[PDB]
Ligand binder design. Structure first.
Ligand SMILES: OC[C@H]1O[C@H](Sc2ccccc2)[C@H](O)[C@@H](n2cc(-c3cc(F)c(F)c(F)c3)nn2)[C@H]1O
Length: 138
């Protein structure tokens, strides 16, 4: 098991064809989960499942620069279920991050932060039991 919030170093940042895999189990009655791919204090890619925003489940994605959130990208396809084991895979591609959950494509998020090799940490937080977090090149 891993303690949440968890920080996964990404040495030398990210690069296309790098695949980051997060395994865990969603807590019962979960409210929120977040992945934060960070460049220093900035958040290049925030991926944030919300289980109860106005009684809807939604995925919110955004970028934080100089402590300011930008424009949210929202996805109502919501593959997580409270109490169940999940896999999040984030594949860095040349123009976007591509996310698949439980082996089904979920969303893409275009790169706003372009210094990919400075996106050197992934933070994992929220209402999960975290089993592992790792990366590989495909
Ligand atoms: O635009 C993403 C951002 O929207 C709000 S702010 C905001 C309000 C209006 C317009 C734009 C932005 C959220 O408050 C913010 N947010 C979530 C979390 C968070 C922290 C945790 F510890 C955790 F476990 C988790 F799942 C999520 N921290 N910051 C962000 O999601």
């Amino acid at each position: 098991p891993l303690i949440v919030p968890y920080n996964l170093p990404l040495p030398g940042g990210v690069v296309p064809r790098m695949l980051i895999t997060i395994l865990g189990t969603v807590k019962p009655n979960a409210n929120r989960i977040a992945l934060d791919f960070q460049r220093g204090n900035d958040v290049a890619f925030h991926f944030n499942p919300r289980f109860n925003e106005n009684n809807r489940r939604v995925i919110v994605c955004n970028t934080k620069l100089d402590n300011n959130w930008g424009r949210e990208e929202r996805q109502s396809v919501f593959p997580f279920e409270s109490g169940k084991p999940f896999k999040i895979q984030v594949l860095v591609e040349p123009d976007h991050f591509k996310v698949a959950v439980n082996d089904a494509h979920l969303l893409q998020y275009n790169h706003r932060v372009k210094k990919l090799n400075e996106i050197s940490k992934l933070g994992i937080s929220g209402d999960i039991d975290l089993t592992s977090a790792s990366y590989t090149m495909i």
